[PDB]
Design a protein around this ligand. Sequence first.
Ligand SMILES: Nc1ncnc2c1ncn2[C@@H]1O[C@H](COP(=O)(O)OP(=O)(O)OP(O)(O)=S)[C@@H](O)[C@H]1O
Ligand SMILES: Nc1ncnc2c1ncn2[C@@H]1O[C@H](COP(=O)(O)OP(=O)(O)OP(O)(O)=S)[C@@H](O)[C@H]1O
Lengths: 218, 218, 219, 219
Amino acid sequence: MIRNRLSELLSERGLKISRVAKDVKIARSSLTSMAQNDSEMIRYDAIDKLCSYLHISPSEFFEHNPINFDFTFDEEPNYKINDVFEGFEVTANITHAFSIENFDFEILVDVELDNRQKLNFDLDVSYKETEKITNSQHRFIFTIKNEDENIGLKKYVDSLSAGLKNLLFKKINQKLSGYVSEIIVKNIDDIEELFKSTTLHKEILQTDSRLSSDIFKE
Amino acid sequence: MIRNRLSELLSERGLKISRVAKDVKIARSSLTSMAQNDSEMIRYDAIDKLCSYLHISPSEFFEHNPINFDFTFDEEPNYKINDVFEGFEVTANITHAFSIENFDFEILVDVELDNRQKLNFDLDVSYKETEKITNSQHRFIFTIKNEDENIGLKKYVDSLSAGLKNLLFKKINQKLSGYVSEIIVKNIDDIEELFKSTTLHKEILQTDSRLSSDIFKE
Amino acid sequence: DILTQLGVKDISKQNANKFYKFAIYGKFGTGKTTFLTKDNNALVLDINEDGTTVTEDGAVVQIKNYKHFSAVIKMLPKIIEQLRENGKQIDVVVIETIQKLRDITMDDIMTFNDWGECATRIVSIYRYISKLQEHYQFHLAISGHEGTIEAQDQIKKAVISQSDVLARMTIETYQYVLNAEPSNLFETKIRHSSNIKINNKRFINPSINDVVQAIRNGN
Amino acid sequence: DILTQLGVKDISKQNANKFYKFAIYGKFGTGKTTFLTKDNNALVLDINEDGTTVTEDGAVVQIKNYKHFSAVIKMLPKIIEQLRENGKQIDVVVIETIQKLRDITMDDIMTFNDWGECATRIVSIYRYISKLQEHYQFHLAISGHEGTIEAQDQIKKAVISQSDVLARMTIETYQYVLNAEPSNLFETKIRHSSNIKINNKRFINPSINDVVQAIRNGN
Ligand SMILES: Nc1ncnc2c1ncn2[C@@H]1O[C@H](COP(=O)(O)OP(=O)(O)OP(O)(O)=S)[C@@H](O)[C@H]1O
Ligand SMILES: Nc1ncnc2c1ncn2[C@@H]1O[C@H](COP(=O)(O)OP(=O)(O)OP(O)(O)=S)[C@@H](O)[C@H]1O
């Protein structure tokens, strides 16, 4: 686990992203992406320009923790989806377009310690309900079936610092949302609205699924 | 007779195929096939990786019994099939497509003892009825005509361990289902449904026939 | 049995409880739908329309797409059994408009080749519904708009041939009657066995039951 | 539930609180708008006209462009909620003139191809309004000018089929009465369940409520 601390440092000093980008001569879009931990690679030039600009040693810019987590999703999931019809074309409410009877699968997590020794925990996740976050948007909610057998996994998770924990939760969710969304888009055909145009597939991809479980509390 | 004991060992330890496959670096599909006794050959590498992983000696992995059974099916069977018409194309109920007036033949079984001596038993099998296991699927049922002359064969069969006996019953059924299905598909022409598409031949091949007799009780 | 091997079957047993199909073209604002759902034991597969307000009781399902239409027909066996389970009584399945079936099938296939395919879709539907009709004891009823029923002959021919009873519903205080009496101006036909005689072919305040009783028992 | 999987639903429950659509065609100065807004609980989407003077209370929105028309219909759910939040009572949404809808849609699309597209726009509007109609409990009413209602059949067919109640308003001292009694000269239709009977199909000083009560409860 490792993340850049640029977002926190800039907030304490109170400098805005726009001013920093203008001075360090780094394009705003790249600096914003790097402010989030979204980017995968960082150019050596960026590490020095920023470190000289904020009088921060390279140590401060990066937060490290020897722990390391891995997540694998089953190649073959069990999914049943029933078309609901009900004229979704008029009003864009996904529920009208399709309903999930049951979607369950397994995620295998390996918590590698600082020592070479690793621990294996197996999580089984099932569909529960489709919550409506806002009138136009919904979030599929999935709950871990077995949590009592995997209580130990929680002890390793909360040991991380808050910033790393928020990063890990984003990673587990982004993957889950991509996995479930990709499976559904294939089974259900797209429907285009009468009255720019928002096809059903585009709405399904936009939809996000967030795991609801005791292990992850934030 | 010989079968792998991987399915039983993993169950007692409770390790899933998905995890074991990730650790021993063996592809899930191969490990699942080998979990069943479907595979014909096993690679030496697989025997050692698994044996080191579950702290099991090679002895434990394989179950052996000196008995050995052989089954031969008559090249020329007596079969009469009468087309029923009745618009099978609309509803996929095999019975509408065709009816078996009478299908009878002989299966020759040789029970070779541990000693060189072998015993020969001859079984005559005839059609009885077509049971409907589920609304969309049926199982042809065949009953052995002469069982009193071949009572001794039963004494050899039940002497095997339960795991071997279940394996033998799968082997006798798989062959029977292939034999009868192949004969019928040739005599009856295929009919494609109006409303993906399921042709009659595909349905016939899917259909399974299970022998119903006192000799085999499981 | 060579008889059983072929489809030959006795008529006396077949015509005893047969569920007849009914085609009613009642023009506009007459009560042909009222007629179909008066029994309050009906499942209405309306197409791009909602006329369920007139029905006293029964079951109903909006059809918005050809794909939706295919699904309901294919799963119709499963559906009807559960309404009987819930305790709802379904004895008749009604398609509100034949002209809408022409419009939807046309969209699915989108020339005389196209028209022939449209006719092929219509003929296939009736054959499918009929085999279930004998199985699930449901009367079938289709209704259309006067413009004889308005449509292209290839469809009309198929509908009239297959339909057991074809009737025209007109309003004559005001009395509303279904007249199936033979006539050059309008075409009607009711099927009854030689012994059965219909003394009166015009029914006032008609219902599917009354027609069924007239065609099975003495008028 | 296979029943729930499909759109199948019970009728007795569907016809209990259904919000009926009302089409009222009349000659000049027959006070047709008075009838629609007499209840003083109406939202009038007038088109290139201002007849709100006859109404005493309610909300009126002028429609000047096809683009303006599309916007109000799309945001109509949000609007109804606000007027009700302000405490204004809206139970009926009225489009003043069907002929103006023909004129505006024609400008947006500007042959039989054009006419068919114009019909497609009109049919699409009703379907959209209907799904909201069940959701927001609003009666729909459209009004036009006698010239049967004047228009091209493709539109007339769609309007008459979808409309629950079609009525002609005429003045007969002089009295203002809405006559929906059946007649060859003019075409009218009121939809009521078999048990419900309309003893009198002519209403003097009519209002949308009175018609609703007549079609739900005994005349
Ligand atoms: N048997 C009847 N006796 C008296 N009035 C009837 C009768 N049947 C229908 N009506 C009248 O007609 C109304 C119902 O007309 P509908 O059944 O909708 O006509 P339809 O011709 O089936 O349908 P459209 O949509 O008008 S083509 C009732 O509410 C009555 O006003
Ligand atoms: N001899 C008859 N006397 C009186 N009515 C008759 C007689 N024959 C037929 N009908 C009437 O016609 C009905 C039967 O018509 P069908 O025999 O089906 O006509 P069809 O012309 O043979 O067949 P399609 O299908 O109509 S071309 C009877 O139920 C009566 O209503």
